[PDB]
């Protein structure tokens, strides 16, 4: 099968999402900052809402893969479970008094259940009667320690972050926060052992859960394979120049890209990702956050054998929207700003995901921008942000495209 993403707007055939669960069920007002999650959510409500989102896509014919599912089938293959536990349960991560007990117990479990735990973490409490456990019940009960043997990954809800399908291949994103790399591990197991991937054909442009990656960090929200051989990558607080360059390089080498346009995010407004200020709705229509987009500094990165490092780089003086338009053959892009005149209230229209040109999934709370997009010709199918939006991320953050056709530029 030919997996690959050749756009942002063209018809999405296959996507991967992940429903909230045990991760979020372990969330408290006191532990969410350290667990990297915005705020505590009504988990059963959010599970529902997600199922709604998911179903509106299946309804439209899109194949929609849920991470818990995939993880579950994956774990049933003994080799793949071992590949994970070998990496997740070590002396360094769990402690020498707990390695064995923890691992045997996890292995004693049911596939579905064991997946919940892998994504949702394990508490000393969940462990079967024993001592190594009590010692943790003890540090928790006497010092105020985290009661976590395996820290929960609520950020899995955001499938966009972890991996990036750029044309005919994927990246295994080195995540900023060490903690979050646990997510990338689980997702690699799936891409490595799951039936639907192991046998599919695709490349691996960058990333390796085995290497450390150092100062090199790359994040999903920042990556966009827009078609026409071009790729946009945001360089900010989360995706570094030392990662982007290695990706470009790996790309130009397999002849996978022609040009990579680095969207330089200014330090101020660089505490975010590209897809948080810039989004495609149609082949030539984007929603934009001005204050940041008018300040983004574009750089065209193109291969070159005249270079020992094989690439050439230039700062464009044209604006990002102009550079982006011209990269697509387009005169300019039609732009809907979002995030003072008609706005009944404040709202931020970005991060809506595309199902196909002109058809978008957005948030019900963004009624102002939503209208603006309809007037501009886009069908907006909404979903609830009461619990899902307490993550600031939108449908684009809750999706990792896997298969999606391109368009004529």
């Amino acid at each position: 099968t030919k997996l690959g993403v050749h756009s942002e707007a063209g018809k999405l055939r296959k996507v991967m999402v992940c429903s909230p669960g045990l991760a979020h069920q372990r969330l408290t007002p006191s532990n969410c900052d350290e667990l990297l999650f915005d705020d505590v959510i009504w988990v059963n409500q959010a599970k529902r809402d997600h199922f709604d989102f998911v179903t509106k896509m299946r309804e439209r014919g899109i194949d929609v893969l849920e991470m818990h599912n995939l993880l579950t089938e994956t774990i049933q293959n003994p080799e793949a479970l071992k590949w994970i536990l070998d990496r997740k349960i070590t002396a360094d991560s769990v402690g020498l008094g707990l390695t064995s007990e923890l691992r045997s117990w996890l292995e004693s479990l049911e596939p579905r259940k064991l997946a919940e735990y892998l994504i949702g973490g394990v508490a000393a409490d969940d462990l079967p009667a024993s001592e190594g456990a009590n010692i943790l019940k003890m540090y928790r009960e006497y010092l105020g320690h985290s009661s976590f043997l395996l820290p929960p990954l609520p950020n899995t809800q955001f499938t966009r972050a972890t991996t990036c399908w750029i044309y005919g291949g994927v990246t295994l994103n080195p995540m900023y926060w060490p903690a979050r790399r646990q997510e990338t591990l689980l997702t690699t197991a799936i891409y490595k052992f799951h039936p639907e991937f192991a046998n599919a054909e695709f490349e691996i442009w960058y990333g390796d859960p085995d290497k450390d990656h150092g100062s090199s960090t790359l994040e999903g929200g920042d990556v966009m394979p827009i078609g026409n051989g071009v790729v946009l990558i945001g360089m900010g607080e989360r995706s570094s120049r030392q990662a982007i360059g290695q990706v470009a390089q790996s790309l130009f080498a397999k002849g996978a890209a022609e040009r990579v346009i680095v969207a330089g995010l200014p330090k101020s407004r660089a505490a975010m990702h590209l897809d948080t200020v810039f989004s495609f709705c149609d082949r030539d229509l984007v929603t934009v956050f001005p204050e940041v987009v008018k300040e983004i500094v574009p750089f065209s990165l193109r291969p070159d054998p005249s270079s020992p490092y094989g690439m050439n780089i230039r700062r464009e003086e044209k604006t990002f929207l102009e550079v982006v338009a011209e990269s697509l053959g387009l005169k300019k892009l039609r732009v809907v700003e979002t995030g003072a005149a008609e706005r009944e209230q404040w709202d931020d229209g970005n991060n809506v995901v595309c199902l196909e040109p002109g058809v978008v999934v957005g948030y019900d709370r963004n009624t102002y921008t939503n209208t603006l997009l309809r007037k501009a010709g886009v069908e907006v199918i909404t979903i609830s942000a009461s619990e899902l939006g307490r993550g600031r991320g939108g449908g684009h953050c809750m999706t990792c495209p896997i298969v999606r056709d391109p368009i004529d530029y």
Copy 2:
């Protein structure tokens, strides 16, 4: 032979590291980025240091200054290859700069080289090139740090990165990934320096070519008191995962008989911030926290899985240290009448009853000179702005035993 056999024993060989380029680079902006509380007055700060250095040297101690070791160390091409191969990678500098940078550093005279290796390198330091310019460009138009190799201003706190527990040392896996650079440089010295290479000693824990994940251990949390006992602070910076592996390695080589884990209450510091030795039975304390340390004692046991047995002590922390040393009681000096607030913890013993402390802790000082301690004072005005002091600026290497 190299080793640290107590906290208050006679100090004969110490390692410190003066402020410098790393600090000259500090800015109110990169201030937190670089994990340093504030921007000090560098030149003034160096003087206070040399002063602190000269004082211990007067008492005859051997004082090794990191820059000197590094400088001597990188004169051994193999020693340099060892570091540059780990410090200059595509992941740390990026594809376009690893060549011109290594080229340019390899061409520097040793002292200048050690300077950068510690103080970092800015785009500006590099001879004109695309790369340098590309870097300057992102710096000019986006505001990113122009640091090819970021500075390591906390090198000045030699206590943090490696720990000499009796006959061996630990190369500590620092909480923050960034500070692991520090530990890289020291390991290099322990590997190639003459005073090290041909020295007899073991490495108890730590490896800079590994990813320890949740295993982290910080200098300020370790204390080989003596009597085959090692005190280790468990807290916001020293994980049990690391700690368990250290006690186990220790026992395994018959280097210690007990590891008393000092459980720091959830109330961001190191044991040595709230507990300092001054004399065989004298310790400065921070009551509020110190009186809330849940004490755990791990001992060797062939009847335990991991091979270790751990038990939660009931008595106060203070008691379980007294009796762990074989003393009835510990003399205690509470800090953190007397005119104004002050914290005089973190002082360093040059030998019994001899401690170097800060000038500003006028109170705590007399409370110690009252307990029969010669409190040799230095300037905290710059070296101390960084919330750190004596014990922190020192990493014992050879300190004779007590009884």
Copy 3:
């Protein structure tokens, strides 16, 4: 008639509430914090869950007063409006040159549009083009300063914060943050001028908007009259002792309270945040905090030069509250199996009936087990404010129990 609150579980008969409005429409990720308001909410939705809540009480026969209407009808009295405006629009507040413009325009608006701007703040843009306001837009655009002739008051949504009805008397609380004193004002004028209260029979226990109360701050959340002369009051970051003493002294004057227990909160919070009644002998707590509050009893002491005797309780809070009410022991339900919810801050309609939040499923179930009836509303946008049912209501007429 005779206004008054005699209990925290009695049959609620008259409550004031105030729905989200233009106030929250001005919220922006930047300004919400400099505006003392948690996070930015979806106003239209919030207006709906609010109305749903207001509706759930009116059908149980409760009479419900909403602030916007109250203001409206209130400012339809030339006097009242002058009383607010002479206060709201001054030179120190608005800017020496705008006073005229800003007042002229407001005075030319229909009541229901004026009141809205009163609670919702008036932006430079809102004013008819002038050399006056146009300067502010220059500052708002070129300097990034707030452009508010009048600042929005989104906290008016919590009518529990500005005034308390301590048995046939009310308190005009001097809020902690100075800005929020702008809310106390409008409710005062409403207690003062509106027909509902104007002719009403009730005392004025403490506070005055014309006064600057120094370090004396009091906030609705801590105050709760529980039955016979007893009155609980939190002394934490928001209700200062300077105010507590003067309130208890005052109540001791007209002799409207026998005892005033002062619950000294430990460690950003209020009493009703960790303590809430649902039935005559039932509560909900946040053990961690409740278990650690140092009680203090206040009683009239003729021998005292300042008229009181500040004794201190030796048993625990739940081991005091239960007493001053004669219960054998207080039925306690805890919050603070599924996930995490904070059941506290439930407003009581009558005994055994409580309007709560829908997200706190566990606690609601526990409460139901303890016997309570839980009518729930949505916290999606109203719960984006840390508080709930209790905080969103100012009881004005509740029945006693015994």
Copy 4:
């Protein structure tokens, strides 16, 4: 000569200061945020640097007045004292059951010890045993409150802040933070009663410790009467337009000012008063923090007899810097940028006379450049006195300084 400041860089004749004191000894790492103090300082050492600094202007023949002191000679007058206690001790400020104990106690004190407390604050312990302080040491006991019935006022060390001398007059500044109002109350007692003041000719342009003032606030750091009948009053995080309007309004009505240049200061979360990013070092010399001064959006209120309110405001085009040099009838200011051996922040120095400033030892670079510009730089230690942020300027409230074009 008559009291009044007529420029920022001309011969300084009289200056009021305040050494670090008892308020500073109450600072703990647990409470310097509620008191508005960056960090805990070595008090007796700061006392020596403050004094060092005093000595340096004193030997140059500048009558250096000190607050604790002026407050003692002032507090001498039973009236002066009634006025202060009457406002400092109230049922709102200290509450019902402490008014008398605390006030009686304060009065049984030696004038200079009483001064100590007014500025340094008073804790419960300081008071004799009682039902009062005890059922109050009790709150600090379990509840862990702020033992202070009176809180110290450590920022008193920055006299520039609470009051300003703009030409033949002064302003009793309405501080941003309430807590900081208690300061202005003391300096006011001093201007109202103390000899060197209550018998001197000057005006009270704006201000009143008894009035509310609402959204109208000002901070000494922002105001500068640079001479030529002009007053630079930066608008920002602490000084608001509401206060500036009423200030200039009076400045115009009484004829003490011809134009006021509001320095519209760019939004930024951290304080930032004009004298912390802009400093006069000479008649045509100024230090500057590029990254800010360039963002300043000048405005020029001038009186207008026909206007209702008595003025008119235009938005200057040229840079805030040309709108200033032109404001002094000057061709163009000479600026020294600050903020290359390390990172140096030279702003906030104070002139004693044209071409002679007093700055910090540590800002070796900036100084080097000022000395490159013809400025004599007398330096004082900032190890404790500068752990704050401001320096020379922020620690002085000029009472009599001469006009320039001299």
